[PDB]
Amino acid sequence: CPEQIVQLMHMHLDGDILPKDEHVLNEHLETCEKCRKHFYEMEKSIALVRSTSHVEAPADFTANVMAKLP
Amino acid sequence: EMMIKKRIKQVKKGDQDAFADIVDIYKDKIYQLCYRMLGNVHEAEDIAQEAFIRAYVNIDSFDINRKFSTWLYRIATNLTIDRIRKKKPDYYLDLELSNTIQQKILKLPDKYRTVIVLKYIDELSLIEIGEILNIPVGTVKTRIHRGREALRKQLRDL
Ligand SMILES: [Zn+2]
């Protein structure tokens, strides 16, 4: 198992992977149940923290800020 | 933006009302940043307000040529980092889905928590995250790789 491979997993997720390096990564995931599982676990986690982009400022937030100003 | 700079120009010259436009445009983003860093509604609204008030107070210090949001985020990030550290007791010596995500976000060290929230919740670039945190683009990349790995340990089992 090349210790290099998680660096490939991360370059992929950065949108940074080389076209050459992408083919190498794809080849290893296909023949490695532990490196699919690792890469599947990061993608899941990313997906789950992306589903928390819904927060908005409480009611009358602006009005509160403007009264607090000098 | 074109609009915000124009609003900033009004603020500097005496027009306090024109700041309200700056608050509306960024209120949700800034409150969201503090709430996902702190995980508590009461401290979030507090620090989000302080960031905007501090932004107004120091508006003349702001370089008009640089991006304003980057400036405002830096203020908010520094207030929340500071609060997170204050909580740590030894500081002055020396099954709902998104709430489960939230509580797992708080188990990340502030240096990885920041980049994950800015990159994955707030959808900023590495270049802008660096500017906000005053660290090289290389270092932010590294922190994200570590954050993704820390995040994986916490969230895989959901
Ligand atoms: Zn492997």
Numbering used by the authors:
A (entry chain C): 3 to 72
B (entry chain A): 2 to 95, 124 to 187
Lines quoted from the article behind this entry:
SigW is one of ECF sigma factors in the gram-positive model bacterium Bacillus subtilis. Its activity is suppressed by the anti-sigma RsiW under normal growth conditions. The cytoplasmic domain (RsiWcyto) interacts tightly with SigW to inhibit SigW activity. In the structure, RsiWcyto interacts with the groove formed along the surface of two domains in SigW (σW2 and σW4), resulting in the burial of the promoter binding area of SigW.
Rod-shaped crystals grown in the condition containing polyethylene-glycol 3350 as a precipitant diffracted up to 2.8 Å resolution. Thus, the structure was determined by the multi-wavelength anomalous dispersion (MAD) method, using a crystal of selenomethionine-labeled SigW/RsiWcyto. The residues of two SigW/RsiWcyto complexes in the asymmetric unit (residues 3-95 and 125-187 in SigW and residues 3-72 in RsiW) were traced into the electron density and the final model was refined with R/Rfree values of 21.0/28.7%. Two SigW/RsiWcyto complexes in the asymmetric unit are superimposed with a root-mean-square deviation (rmsd) of 0.7 Å for 224 Cα atoms, indicating that the two complexes have the same conformation. The x-ray emission spectrum measured in the synchrotron facility revealed that the crystal contains zinc ion bound to SigW/RsiWcyto. In the structure of RsiWcyto, the zinc ion is coordinated by residues C3 in L1’, H30 in α2’, C34 in L3’, and C37 in α3’. The three N-terminal alpha-helices (α1’-α3’) form a helical bundle and coordinate a zinc ion. By contrast, RsiWcyto interacts with SigW by wrapping the surface of SigW, resulting in a large surface burial of 3324 Å2. The surface binding area of SigW/RsiWcyto is divided into three binding motifs of RsiWcyto. Taken together, anti-sigma RsiW inhibits the promoter binding of SigW by directly blocking the binding surface of -35 element in σW4.
